[PDB]
Write a protein that binds this ligand. Sequence first.
Ligand code: GTP
Lengths: 60, 49, 120, 459, 320, 139, 99, 347, 63, 57, 98
Amino acid sequence: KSASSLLDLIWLETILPKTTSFIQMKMSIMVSNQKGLIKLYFLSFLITIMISMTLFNYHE
Amino acid sequence: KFYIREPPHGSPDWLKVGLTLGTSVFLWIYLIKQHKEDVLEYKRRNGLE
Amino acid sequence: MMSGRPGRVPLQFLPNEARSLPPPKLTDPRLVYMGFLGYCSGLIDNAIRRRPVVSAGLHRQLLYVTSFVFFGYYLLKRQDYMYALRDHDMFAYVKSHPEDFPEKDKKTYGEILEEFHPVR
Amino acid sequence: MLKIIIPTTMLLPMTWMSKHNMIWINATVHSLLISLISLSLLNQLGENSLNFSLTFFSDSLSAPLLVLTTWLLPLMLMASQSHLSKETTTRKKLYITMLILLQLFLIMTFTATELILFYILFEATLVPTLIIITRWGNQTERLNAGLYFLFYTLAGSLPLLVALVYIQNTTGSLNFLIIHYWSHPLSNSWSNIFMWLACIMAFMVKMPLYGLHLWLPKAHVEAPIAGSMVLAAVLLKLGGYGMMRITTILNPLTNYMAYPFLMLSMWGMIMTSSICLRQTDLKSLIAYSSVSHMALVIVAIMIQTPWSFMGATALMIAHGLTSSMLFCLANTNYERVHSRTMILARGLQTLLPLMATWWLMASLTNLALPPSINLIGELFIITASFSWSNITIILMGMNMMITALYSLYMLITTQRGKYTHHINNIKASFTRENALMALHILPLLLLTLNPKMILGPLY
Amino acid sequence: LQYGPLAFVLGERTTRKLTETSKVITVDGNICSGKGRLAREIAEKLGLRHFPEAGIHYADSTTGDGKPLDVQLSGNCSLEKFYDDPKSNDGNSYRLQSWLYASRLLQYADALEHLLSTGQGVVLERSIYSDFVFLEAMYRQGFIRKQCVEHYNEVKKVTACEYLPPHVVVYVDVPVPEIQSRIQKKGNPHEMKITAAYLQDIENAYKKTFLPEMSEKCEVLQYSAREAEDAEKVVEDIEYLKCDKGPWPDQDDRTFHRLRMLVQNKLEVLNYTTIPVYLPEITIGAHQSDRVFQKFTELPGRKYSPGYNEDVGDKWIWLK
Amino acid sequence: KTLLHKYSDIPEGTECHRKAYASTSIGGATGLIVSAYSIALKPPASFLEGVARTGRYTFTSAAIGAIFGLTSCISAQVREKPDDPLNYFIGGCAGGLTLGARTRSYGIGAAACAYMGLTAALVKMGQLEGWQVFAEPKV
Amino acid sequence: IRLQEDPDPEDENLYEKNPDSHGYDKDPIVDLWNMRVVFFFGFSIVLVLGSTFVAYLPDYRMQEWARREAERLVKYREANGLPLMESNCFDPNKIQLPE
Amino acid sequence: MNPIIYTTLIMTVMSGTMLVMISSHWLLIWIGFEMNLLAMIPVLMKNFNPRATEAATKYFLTQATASMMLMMAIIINLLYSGQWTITKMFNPVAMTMMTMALAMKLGLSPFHFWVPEVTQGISLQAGLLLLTWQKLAPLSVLCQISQSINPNLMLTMAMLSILIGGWGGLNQTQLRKIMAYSSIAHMGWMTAVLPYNTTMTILNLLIYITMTLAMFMLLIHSSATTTLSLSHTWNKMPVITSLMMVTLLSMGGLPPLSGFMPKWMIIQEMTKNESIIMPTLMAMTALLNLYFYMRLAYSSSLTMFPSTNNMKMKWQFEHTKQMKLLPTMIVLSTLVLPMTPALSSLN
Amino acid sequence: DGPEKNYEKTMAILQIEAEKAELRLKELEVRRLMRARGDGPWYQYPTIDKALIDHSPKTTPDN
Amino acid sequence: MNVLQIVRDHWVHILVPVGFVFGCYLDRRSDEKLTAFRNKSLLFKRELRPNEEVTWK
Amino acid sequence: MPLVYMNIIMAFAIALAGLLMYRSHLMSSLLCLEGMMLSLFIMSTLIILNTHFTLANMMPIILLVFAACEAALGLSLLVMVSNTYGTDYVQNLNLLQC
Ligand SMILES: Nc1nc2c(ncn2[C@@H]2O[C@H](COP(=O)(O)OP(=O)(O)OP(=O)(O)O)[C@@H](O)[C@H]2O)c(=O)[nH]1
C-alpha cells in the first residue's frame, strides 16, 4: 500500500507522465478545434496585428 | 506466358540500358580525368611542380 | 559564416582559385560513403517496384552509384573551398587586427593558485 | 578500433542475404568470433587510454563493456531461436539486423572519443530498441511501453544536447581527453547548477532512479525475450559510462549538488527493494531488483571516490550479467507456460532438475555473495560510502537485507515446493536454454577469478 | 508506353475513335433470366465485345495466369454455401455481396478501358448501378444486417460517382414461376433452395428502383424472355436509338482523358473498395492477413513484377 | 513594454504596494490579451455573456498578478533579501493556488504551485544572472 | 463471429514430433550443426583460449613492472635514510610561493 | 485539366518563385508572389470538389491580404528611403509589416489557421506542391532582409509556429492535417534560426523539403488520407510501410537519421550566440511532433491492423505510376548525417 | 604494439585536438568581431552599386 | 562435389574474416596518417639505429 | 509628412479593418480588398509624382495591372462557391471543418 500501488502505480506515473499528457490533452482540443469560419480566423489576424504593432510595439 | 498481358518490363529495353551504361562510363572517365587535372593543376600552381 | 564576400561570382559552383587547394582523393572516406550512399538509393529502388532487390537491373544501380559519387566529388571541393576561405580570411583578419587579439601570456601551473577541492 | 567495428558492420549483409535457415548459424558463429577479437582489447597500457584514431579510443573503463556487448550478441541471438522460428524469413533477417545495428551502435558509443559523437550514438540506441519492443512484442501494453521508454529517454537527452553544444562553444572542444586535461572548477554560479543538471539528468533518465523508474518496469515486462536482456544489460550502463566521463568537468559543484539525487538513490534502492517483496510478475521482480542495483551504482558514481568508481565499474558488468541471467529464466518459464504470473507455477525443481540449479546460482549471484564479482563490486561501494558519510551503511544494509529476501523468495515460490497440478505441458528443458545460462554463468566466475580486467580504469 | 500525359500531348485523342459502335449496354434481370444468352447474341449481332458476368473469380480471370484461385485465397465467400445457409451470418452473405460488387467494379473498369482504348461497344451482365438490388433483397430476407447494407450504399456512392453510366440496358423480365422452372431445368443443386420470396423480391427491387433510378441517365428497353430468345429485334431497336440522354452525349476529350487515366490504373479504380471502415464480416484478422500473405507471395508470378519473376522463368534480369 | 518597466523599475521589497499595482496591471494586460483571443476565436451568443467571459479571464489573471506582486515584495522585505528565487516562488505559486480556486479546482491549483512557482523562480533566476530569453544576433 | 480469424495455434515442442532434437530448429541436421557451433567457440576457444588470453595478457598497467621498479627506489632511499615515501610528490623548490 | 495546361501552370508557379529569388527590385518580388498566387489557385482546383473550392478560397483570401500588406511595407520603405532595392529596411514599422505579410504566406503565427484547412481540402499532390514549393519564395525574401528583423518578433513568431504546430497535430487523424501541422512546426524550426544565420535555415529548408517529398510520394504511393486507410496499407505495401516507418523516425530527429541534423545545427548556433533558454523550448516541444509521429508509425507498420476481405484482390494489381525520384528521395532524407560538413557548401 | 606506439600516437591526437579547439574559440571571436565592426571580408551586407548613377548633364541644372 | 553449388549456398562465412583483416589494414593506414611525433616522444627519444629507419609502423 | 499622406494611410488602415474584419459577406470583403489597392495606388502615385521618379511613374499601372487580376479571380472564385452554396454569405462556408 505504500511502495507499490500508491507510490509507483499511483503517484509517480500521475505526476510526470499522466499530468503532462493531460496538459497536452487539455491544450490540444483548445488549440485544434476551430470550426473553420473565416471570420474568427481573420479577427485572430486582427488583434495579432495590433499586438505586434502597438501593444508590444515590436518596432519600438 | 503465365500472365496473359504482356509484362510492362518483360523485354530488355535495350536503348535505356545502353544510355545508362554509356552515362556511367562517361561520368567515371570524366571523374578520373577531372581528378588528374586537378592534382596536376595543384602541383603546378602552388610550386610543387 | 559569407554571401557578401568581395569578388564572389554568383551561380558559380567551383571558383577558379579553389584549384590551389588539394583536390579530394578518389579514396576519400567521405566520398566512398557517398558512393555507398548510392547503393542505398539503388537497393531501395528495386524494393519500391517489388523487383528483386539484390540484382534487379544493375544498369540502374550503376548510374545510381556513379552519379552520387560524382556530385559528391564536386561538393567536396566546394566543401573544402568554403572551409579554406573561412580559415583564410580568418588569419587575414587576425593579422590585420593585432589589437583585438592580445598575446595572452603563458604561465606554468607553478605560478597559478588553483585551489584543490576535497571531494569526500 | 576498426578491427572490431568493421567486422560488425560488414556482418550485416551476411545475415541479410544468407539462406533462409543458415542465417541463425552464421550470425551466431560470426558473433562468437568477433567477440573473440573483442576480448583482445582488455589490454590497457599503464594509465593511458588505449588510443586508436582521432575519433575512436578505449580504456579499462570501456573494454569490459565492449567485450560484454560482443559476448551478449550471441546470447539473445540464439535465445531468439524459440521465439522467432515461426515468422517470415525476411522478418527474421530484419530482426537480426536490428540486433546487429544495436550492438554496432553500442560499440560505437563506448569507443567514442569526442562528446557529441557519443551523444549521437547514445540516442541512436533507441531506434533499434524501440523497433524491437514495439514490433516483436507479445501483449497489448507494449505500445505504451515503447511510448514511455522513448519519451523518457528523449526528455532526458535533449537538455544534454543543449548543454553539450554550449560546452563546445565555451570551452573549445568536446574531446574526452582534453576536457579531462583542460578541466576547470565548475563554480557555484546559478547557471552552473543548471549546467550540471543538464549534463547529469540525461544519464540519470536511463539509469532508473527513485521516481523516474516507470519505463523499465513497463517496458521490460513485455519486451521481446531477446530484446529485454539487451535493455536490462547494456543501455543502463552506457549512461554509467556517460557519468564516468562527464563527471570530470562537473566538479567541484558535484560535492553538494549531488545530495538530492544521492539520497534519492539510497532510500530509492530500498523502495525498489521494498517494492521487490511483492510482485505479481517475475519479469517485474527482476526489473525492480535491477532498479535497486542501478540505484546502488548511482550512489557509487556520485561520491567521486576511486573505490566507489571500482565498485561501480564492477557493478555494471555484474548486474547486467545477473539481470539478463534471470531474464532468460523468466523467458523460459513463460514460454513453457505462456503466462508471466508469479505464483502460477511453484516447485519447478520437481520437473526440471537442472533448470532450478541454474535458478540457484542465478539468485546466488543476485545475492552478491563472496567471492563473486557481484560481492566485490558491492563491497567497494560499501567501503567508499562508509568513508563518505559513516551511517550510509544503515540504508545500504537494508538493501543487502532485502535483496536475498526477494531473490530466495522467488526460488521458493518458483522452484521449491511442488508443481501446481493443473499445468501438464511442461516438457523437459531443451539444451538451448541450459546451454545459454551456462555461457552466461560460467564466464561470470571466470572473469571473477581475474577481477583486474573489470576492476576499473583507476587501477 | 501506356496512355500517359505524353500520349494526350503528342496527339492521342479518344474522340477520334468513338462512333455509334461505342454503346455500353448491360443485360439485367432476375437470376437465370437468360440474359447471358441475350448478351452473347447482342454482342455478336452488333460487333460489340462481350464480357462474361464477373463472379467470385474475376480477379484471376483478369490478372495473372487466368486460373481460378482458392476461395480462401480469393473472396473467402461461397454463393453455393450462401444458398446452403443464408442466415448463419458467419459472413458469407455480405462478404459475397461486397466481393461481387467490387468484381463488377473491376469489370466495368476494364470495359470502359477497352472502349476508350479501342472504340468498340461493350455489353455486360449487371453493373454497379444494378447489383444493389440483390443486396436490398438479401436484406429483406434478413441475410445481411443493416450496417452491412448502409456500408454497401456508402461504398456505392463513393465508387460509382466517378463512373459515367451505360448507354442502354436491356432487362429480361421473367415471372417468378418461370424462373423457378429454369433453375429446376439447370441441375446444379446449389441453386435449387432459393426462396420464392427472394426471387420475387429482387424483381421488385429491380422494377421499382433500378429502372426509374436509371431511366433519367439512360434508355430503358426492358424485355421478356419471349422476345429475348429472338436476337434480331433486340438488336434492331438497340441500333435505332438516339442515345442522347446522360453524361455520355456531353463529355469532351478532357473527360475522356481523365477517364482513361483512371481506368488504365486499376489500383485506384477500386481504392475505396478497401473499405476503410471496420465491420465484423468484412474485417479479416491481422494474423489471418499475414498468413494469407505468406501463402500468396510465394505463389508463382506474384512475388516480383511481371517479367522480373525468375521463379517462372524470366530472363536477362541482371540487365532488366 | 513600459508596463513591464513599471514592474522592473520598482525594486523588490521597497514600495511593495506600487510593485503589486504594476503586477496587477501586467496580469490585467495578459488577461485582456487572452480575453481578446477568446472573444475573437471562440464565438459567444450575447454581448453580456461575452464580456462576462472577458471579465472572468481578466479578473483571474489580475488576481494572480496582484498576489504575486504583493507576496513577492513582502517576502523581499521581511527577509530583506530581494535576491531570492524563493521570494518569487512562494508568491508565484500561491498565484497558482488562487488560479485553481478561481476555476474551483484545488487539484490543478496544487499542480500549479509546482509549475507557476518554478517558472517565477526561473524568471527571477534569469533576471539576477542576465539569462536572455530573446537573444540578439551577436555571432 | 465479429471477425474471420485463425484460432491460436498450438505451441509445438520439437521433441514430440522429432525426438533427439535440441530446441534449435525443425530440421534435425541443422539442429546438430547449431549444437556444434554453439558448443564450439561459445564454450570453446572464446570461452577457454579466451580465458588464457585474458589471464595471460601483457603487463596490466605495468603493475608487474611497477612492482619490480619500486624496491629499487626503496633501497636507494633507505641507503641514505630518506624514507620510501614523501610528503610531497611535486617538488616545492621548482614551484613558486604566491606572495 | 489539359496536360499541357497543367504543365503551363507548373512552370508559371515555378517561374513566379524564380522571379522572387532572382529579382532585386521590390516590385518584382511582389509580382513574382502574385504570379505564384494566380498560378497555384487553378491546380488546387484540379479535382473540383467543394472541399477544393473551400481550400482555394481560403488560400486566395489569406495570400491576397498578405500580398497587399507586402505592398504596404513596400510603399512605406519607399516613402521613407526612396529605394526599391531589397536590403535592410529604413523604417521599423515597414519591417514589421513585411514580417507579418510574409508570415501569413508562410503560416507561422496565428496567421497559420489557413494551411491545415487548405491542406485538408486539396488532393495530396496539390498538398506536396503547397507544402514544398510555396515556401521557397517567402523564405528567400526573409533571408534577403535578415539584416534588420526585430529578433523578438521573429523568435516569438517561430515559437508559436512550432508550439501550435505540435499541439494541433495531436488531435488529427487525416494525414494531410497532421502533415500540415508538422510543416508548421518545421516552419517555426527554420524561422527561429532565420535571424541568426541564414545558412542553417537554408539547410533546414532543404532537409524539410526532401523529407516532405519523401513523405508525400509515399502517401500517394499508398493512396491513403486517413490513419485507418494507411493502417489498411500495412498489407499491400509492406516495403512502402516500412519506409513509411523509417522516414517517420527521421521526422522527429532521432539520431543518426537526417532529421536530427537540422535540429542539432540550429541548437548549436543558437547556443553560440548566448541563446540557451530558447533552443530548449523547441527541443522539448519536438516531442509533441514525435508523439503523433509514433502514433502514425504504430498505425502503419509496428502493429498489424485489421485488413478487409475485398482488399485481397488489390494483391492482383501493381502500382503503374512510377512516381520517380522516390528511392533517392528516401535515401537523402534518411542517411546524410555523416555529411553534415557539406552545409558549408550553402554558405 | 609497444607502449611507445600508443603514447606517440596519442600526444599527436591531443595536439591536433588542441590546435582545433583554440581555432574554434578564435573563430567564435572573429565571427563576432566581424559581425559587429564589419571591417573585413564576410558578414558584409550588400549596398547600392555606384555604376547605376548617371553623371551626364540633365534638363535642369543643380541636380 | 558440386563446389559451385556449395559456394552458391555457403559463401557467407568468408566475408566476415576478410572484413576483419580489412579493419587491421585500415588501422595500419590510420597509423601512417598520425606519425607527427616520429621518435619525438620525450621518454622514448631512443636513437635510431643505423640498420632500421622507423620507430614503429 | 503632410495630411494627404495621413488620409490615404488612414484609408488603407480602415480598408484593412473592413476587409479583414469580416462582417458577413464575401463579395463586399473582396470589394474592400480591391479598395485597399486603390488606397495603395494613390499613395504610391503621390511620392512618385512628388520626387520626380520618372521611371517609377510606370510602377502604379504595373501595380494596378496585377491587382485587378487578383480581383479577376476573386469574384471568379465567388461564383464557384455561389452556384453550389447559393450565396456569398460566409457562415455556411463551413464544409471544410476537419
Ligand atoms: N448475391 C448476389 N448474387 C448475384 C449477384 N449478381 C449475380 N448473382 C448470382 O449470379 C448467379 C448467376 O446468375 P444468372 O447469370 O442470371 O444465372 P444463370 O443460371 O447463369 O443463367 P443466365 O442468366 O442465362 O446466365 C446467380 O446465382 C445469382 O444469384 C449479386 O449482385 N448478388
